[PDB]
Design a protein around this ligand. Structure first.
Ligand code: Y01
Ligand code: ATP
Ligand code: ADP
Ligand code: ESV
Ligand code: MG
Ligand code: MG
Length: 1141
């Protein structure tokens, strides 16, 4: 598989020991942070020392070119002592070249092996850090899951790509110094002047780098913001699309994109300047050197010296060809390692089964969210935690699990025992249903059936494509909220631990499923195993089953004891409970995105630049053929023209890159955000978000450099071939066999490359997903205490990915070695042809360039093929389906206040989510009067939510009309329909930013109206107490607030719009009973004029409703007042009321 030295385990151990030594040295002195660079050096330097040795040998051998060329020129111009003989020199040059290329490829091999080792070690390090990072980092707003994914995907890769090029950072200096020294032997003091010019690259390239670094950091800043926004949109599209806010958010994404593009433009401008310097300073150096030689030594050079010096200048130019790339990648790698070091230095986690005494706990800020927590959880008994929204229940569970800072007190666990945690926000992995349920336990079919039937999952799984083997979670079929919650509860029930922490498992479930779960699963299955159970529920009806009750109010514990103990001690609390219960083409597209002016300017300017630059060489050769003011002036104007042409050629490629990046991302975002909701239902969020996160990165920062290097190298190679052939025609024959060879090697590489490339991706998507599904659901992993299994899985995945990438690099090395030997053959053939008249001097001169730049032509062509494959995905998404926002209704017919009265009439409505599916709604017909209060109820899977989403045309209608206040909704534009009606979905979708931003993204609401909304939604006091008020922050996903508070914010978001018709879809699922009562009464007293249709989670709420509807499998069974339905003996509605009560 993978050699032991290349396993991620050994590399990780080495790097970790180096980093721990660094941490010791950092602890020694104040303000000295541990550094990743020194740890990486300690761990992996000796390999790089060997690679640098090989590179120095390669450069020493490379200097043999000038000497042999000069000898051949001298001997063409005019035993065993025949080493001057031209043909012997040619063969010796061939041997020197092949030896050089062998050493160079050896250095490349060593460095790629080391870089893969280190990517493995760094991914293991940051993964263990994930398994140790405190969730308060992600909940208080320090960092995001997206930032961690960015680390893993982009920043580690950038560090690796830099470490592929690291030897150059000291090999290129040496080679450029040596060169100058050798020039000093041929040209005398003249070389010094040229040397000085060359040395100016050292100051310059520092300055530029500085700028680049800043410009990069800013980009990485704005990018991270942009992506954040993007992700939220893709995760909350439904809400946005239901509120008509799609474009308000698209505009903010585009603003951040404009900032990122400006930073990218600064980076591109300075990259262009670095290219211009690296190209022109050589021309300036040659100009200075040869003018000084012409006017200092009265004699012109003999041809031998002339071609020797010109060859030495070529050898100088070769490093400067790649200097720009190495500085670019070193800057980006410095930024990436800064981010990695910031991450790796962050905050981390710190009878009676559990006893918390004198506990004061806080969520990081240093202010106590819990206080005077004196609790005990009896062993093998049902503990139930009760309290209104935001009262420290989930906080209590996560405090016992040591997930939050402990200010005072202690938790005793009669080290922690494993405990089955069913998080309130269900976390599902990217494996099958069976893998999610078993979750690392040996499959027992009897126990599996017990769990599955206790959670009623069997009816739902048998529907799925393959019941127990269908892939779930992101990157799989998306289950409903209730199904995911019941799968998570099944996982909690299946693991063979002795403590089960079930956090509100009945939020998404209906009455029947919840009652079945309670009775069978929790009152029979869990008690047969004699397991301790701690339930966090608002269902007061189940308090009779509880053995121990922990009431919580405002962070502290109100009272603790059995029901009788509470009744005798806290009479008021028991009475309160009682009252509450009531007892390719893509490459062409990328090139042409500039409009045919940038493209043709690029091609013509490049051709003209190389024309001038070869004319300079021909001029030097012919000028030294003499051994004059005419020659000097011609040379000077030629050099000036070359410098200006370099300046022009530098900017065109970068400008093309900027233009194409902007256009591609703009089209992608807009077309995505206009897609129908079905597209998001079917497609994983991961694919769409990958487009932006990774492919936009490729399109912005990785295609332009590849393209410019490819164009320069290919023009150099074609020019050298043409020059050689013009000098020696016969070379053309040699070109045909060689040509064939080239073709074939290319061919073979491709058929393998593709395959290997695919493998790489296929092996990396799992790894990334792993890092994603541990960062999410970290608390569940660490509550089951399964960190070891997940670390082992990460090591396995990273080793597989390393194998794939190593084989890919091996194929690349195969192609590079073959093409280098082919270039050496080109050199030898052209050399023999030239030896057997000014033409042939420059012809033989360019043969070395042929090898040097043919390698790069091939490599960059491969890189560009991969990156154009990236571009293809955006261009593919451009073919999506688009929702019909136009609408047939004339805008004149729509009154200024369309839902003026609020009457609705549904006639023969039939709905199916996608073509060729079952009709979820079947001929429903109902007329809600203006100012009517309608309550819709029923089991899960009865089409209540479909009837809700019908009004907003988010479900495709086969037949029927929805005539809202005298206009068929089918005709109106989508935006008018979806802006003048307000829906309160069940799952809260809360964006990042201030409270104000979530309550009105447009900024078009008075502060007074926001306070009104928050007062109806029962969040006035909490927002008042928050530090910033209405400017207080909401971290991504609303994690800093409880679930009930997230739902209440989602209710406030609907109370501000103040439209005439409200559709409340199971809004009080997560809210407790007392908050729910007061909220319903206040909402009814406030919206008494409007028409509100409430899909009810508890039928009690809809007992005081003007009209009631009970849906069963897409049909309205009963349509009448709640009094009439209650009067019926054995009616469905009557049955619902008895069970809930
Ligand atoms: C000109 C000949 C003799 C050698 C050609 C390369 C060298 C000039 C060396 C010496 C100085 C080096 C540069 C000086 C230091 C930097 C900055 C470094 O980035 C940073 O220092 C962080 C940015 C910051 O300091 O705020 C990236 C590498 C780079 C460009 C180095 C790249 C390699 C350089 C150009
Ligand atoms: N992840 C978090 N990070 C920081 N503060 C939090 C976090 N979760 C909750 N809080 C704060 O803790 C306080 C108590 O909320 P808690 O998490 O205990 O909710 P809960 O009572 O379990 O929720 P509910 O019963 O509505 O589902 C709230 O004021 C909230 O501001
Ligand atoms: N996103 C979806 N795509 C296709 N079909 C769906 C989707 N959601 C639900 N359904 C189907 O529609 C029916 C009713 O679902 P739903 O409207 O969610 O019921 P509820 O009223 O309980 O929310 C179910 O039988 C289910 O198969
Ligand atoms: C040394 C600078 C001058 C302009 C005198 N000569 C160059 N400059 C470049 N580039 N010659 C050359 C040609 C082709 C491939 N490599 C090098
Ligand atoms: Mg909770
Ligand atoms: Mg529903």
């Amino acid at each position: 598989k993978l050699p032991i030295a290349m396993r991620a385990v050994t590399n990780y151990v080495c790097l970790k020991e180096a980093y721990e030594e660094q941490k010791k040295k950092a602890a020694d002195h104040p303000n000295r942070t541990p550094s990743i660079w020194l740890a990486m050096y300690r761990a992996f330097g000796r390999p790089i020392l060997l690679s640098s040795t090989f590179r120095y040998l390669a450069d020493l051998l490379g200097f043999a070119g000038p000497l042999c060329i000069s000898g051949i020129v001298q001997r063409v111009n005019e035993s065993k002592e025949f080493l001057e003989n031209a043909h012997v020199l040619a063969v010796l040059l061939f041997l020197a070249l092949i030896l050089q290329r062998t050493f160079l490829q050896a250095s490349y091999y060593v460095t790629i092996e080391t870089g893969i080792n280190l990517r493995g070690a760094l991914l293991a390090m940051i993964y263990n850090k994930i398994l140790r990072l405190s969730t308060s980092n992600l909940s208080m707003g320090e960092m995001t899951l997206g930032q961690i994914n960015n680390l893993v995907a982009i920043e580690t890769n950038q560090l690796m790509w830099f470490l592929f090029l690291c030897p150059n950072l000291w090999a290129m200096p040496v080679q450029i110094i040596m060169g100058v020294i050798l020039l000093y032997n041929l040209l005398g003091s003249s070389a010094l002047v040229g040397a000085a010019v060359i040395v100016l690259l050292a100051p310059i390239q520092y300055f530029i780098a500085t700028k680049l670094a800043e410009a990069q950091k800013s980009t990485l800043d704005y990018s991270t913001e942009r992506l954040k926004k993007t992700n939220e949109i893709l995760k909350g599209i439904k809400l946005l699309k239901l509120y008509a806010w799609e474009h308000i958010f698209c505009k903010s994404v585009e603003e951040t994109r404009m900032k990122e593009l400006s930073s990218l433009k600064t980076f591109a401008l300075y990259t262009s300047l670095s290219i211009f310097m690296n190209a022109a300073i050589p021309i300036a150096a040659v100009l200075a050197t040869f003018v000084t030689h012409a006017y200092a030594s009265g004699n012109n050079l003999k041809p031998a010296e002339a071609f020797a010096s010109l060859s030495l200048f070529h050898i100088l130019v070769t490093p400067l060809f790649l200097l720009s790339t190495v500085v670019r990648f070193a800057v980006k790698a410095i930024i990436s390692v800064q981010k990695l070091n910031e991450f790796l230095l962050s905050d981390e986690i710190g009878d009676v089964a559990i006893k918390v005494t004198n506990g004061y706990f806080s969520w990081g800020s240093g202010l106590a969210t819990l206080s005077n927590i004196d609790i005990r959880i009896p062993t093998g008994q049902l503990t139930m935690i009760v309290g209104q929204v935001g009262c420290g229940k989930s906080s209590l569970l996560l405090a016992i699990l040591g997930e939050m800072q402990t200010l005072e007190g202690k938790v005793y666990w009669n080290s922690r025992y494993s405990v089955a945690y069913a998080a309130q926000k269900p976390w599902l992995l990217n494996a099958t249903v069976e893998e999610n349920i078993t979750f690392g336990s040996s499959f027992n079919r009897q126990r599996y059936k017990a769990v599955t039937d206790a959670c009623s999952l069997q009816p739902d799984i048998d529907l799925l494509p393959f019941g127990d083997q269908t892939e779930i979670g992101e990157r799989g079929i998306n289950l409903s909220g209730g199904q995911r919650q019941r799968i998570c509860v099944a996982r909690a029930l299946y693991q063979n631990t002795n403590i089960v922490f079930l956090d509100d498992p009945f939020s998404a479930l209906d009455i029947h499923l919840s009652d079945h779960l309670m009775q069978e699963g929790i009152l029979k299955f869990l008690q047969d195993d004699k397991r301790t159970v701690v339930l966090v529920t608002h269902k007061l009806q189940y308090l009779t089953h509880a053995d121990w009750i922990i009431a919580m109010k405002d962070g502290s514990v109100l009272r603790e004891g059995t029901l009788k103990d509470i009744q005798t001690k806290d009479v008021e609390l028991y009475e309160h409970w009682k009252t509450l219960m009531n007892r390719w083409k893509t490459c062409w597209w990328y090139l042409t995105s500039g409009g045919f002016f940038l493209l043709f300017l690029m091609i013509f300017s490049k051709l003209l630049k190389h024309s001038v630059i070869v004319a300079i060489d021909y001029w030097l050769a012919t000028w030294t053929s003499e051994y004059q003011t005419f020659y000097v002036a011609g040379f000077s104007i030629l050099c000036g023209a070359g410098i200006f042409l370099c300046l022009v050629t530098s900017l065109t490629v970068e400008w093309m890159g900027l233009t194409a990046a902007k256009n591609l991302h703009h089209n992608l975002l807009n077309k995505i955000i206009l897609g129908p909701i079905r597209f998001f239902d079917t497609t994983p969020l991961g694919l769409i978000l990958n487009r932006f996160s990774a492919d936009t990165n490729i399109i912005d920062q990785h295609i332009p450099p590849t393209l410019e290097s490819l164009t320069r190298s290919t023009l150099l190679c074609l020019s050298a071939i043409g020059m050689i052939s013009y000098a020696t025609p016969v070379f053309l024959i040699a070109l045909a066999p060689l040509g064939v060879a080239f073709y074939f090697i290319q061919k073979y590489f491709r058929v393998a490359s593709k395959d290997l490339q695919e493998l790489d991706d296929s092996t990396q998507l799992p790894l990334l997903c792993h890092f994603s599904e541990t960062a999410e659901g970290l608390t569940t992993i660490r509550a089951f205490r399964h960190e070891t299994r997940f670390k082992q899985r990460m090591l396995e995945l990273t080793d597989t990915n390393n194998i794939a990438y190593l084989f890919l690099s091996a194929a690349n090395r195969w192609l590079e070695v073959r093409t280098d030997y082919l270039g050496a053959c080109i050199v030898l053939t052209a050399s023999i042809a030239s030896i057997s008249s000014g033409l042939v001097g420059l012809g033989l001169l360019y043969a070395l360039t042929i090898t040097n730049y043919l390698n790069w032509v091939v490599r960059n062509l491969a890189d560009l093929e991969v990156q154009m494959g990236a571009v293809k995905k955006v261009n593919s998404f451009l073919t999506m389906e688009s929702e019909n926002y136009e609408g047939t209704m004339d805008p004149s017919q729509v009154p200024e206040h369309w839902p003026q009265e609020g009457e609705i009439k549904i006639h023969d409505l039939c709905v199916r989510y996608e073509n060729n599916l079952k009709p979820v709604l079947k001929h429903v017909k109902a007329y809600i009067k203006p100012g009517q209060k309608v309550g819709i109820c029923g089991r899960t899977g009865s089409g209540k939510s479909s009837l809700s989403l019908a009004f907003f045309r988010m479900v495709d209608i086969f037949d029927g009309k929805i005539v809202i206040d005298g206009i068929d909704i089918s005709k109106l534009p989508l935006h008018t329909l979806r802006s003048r009606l307000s829906i309160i979905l069940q799952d809260p979708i809360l964006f990042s930013g201030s409270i104000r931003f979530n309550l009105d993204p447009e900024c078009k609401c008075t502060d007074d109206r926001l306070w009104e909304a928050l007062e109806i939604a029962q969040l006035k006091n909490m927002v008042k107490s928050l530090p910033g008020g209405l400017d207080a922050t909401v971290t991504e996903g609303g994690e800093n607030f409880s679930v009930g508070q997230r739902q209440l914010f989602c209710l406030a978001r609907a109370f501000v719009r103040k439209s005439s018709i409200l559709i409340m879809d199971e809004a009080t699922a997560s809210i407790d009973m007392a908050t729910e009562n007061i909220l319903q009464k206040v909402v009814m007293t406030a919206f008494a004029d409007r028409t509100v249709v409430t899909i009810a989670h508890r039928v009690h709420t809809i007992l005081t409703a003007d009209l009631v509807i009970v849906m069963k499998r897409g049909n309205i069974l009963e349509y009448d007042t709640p009094e009439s339905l209650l009067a019926q003996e054995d009616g469905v509605f009557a049955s619902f009321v008895r069970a809930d009560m």
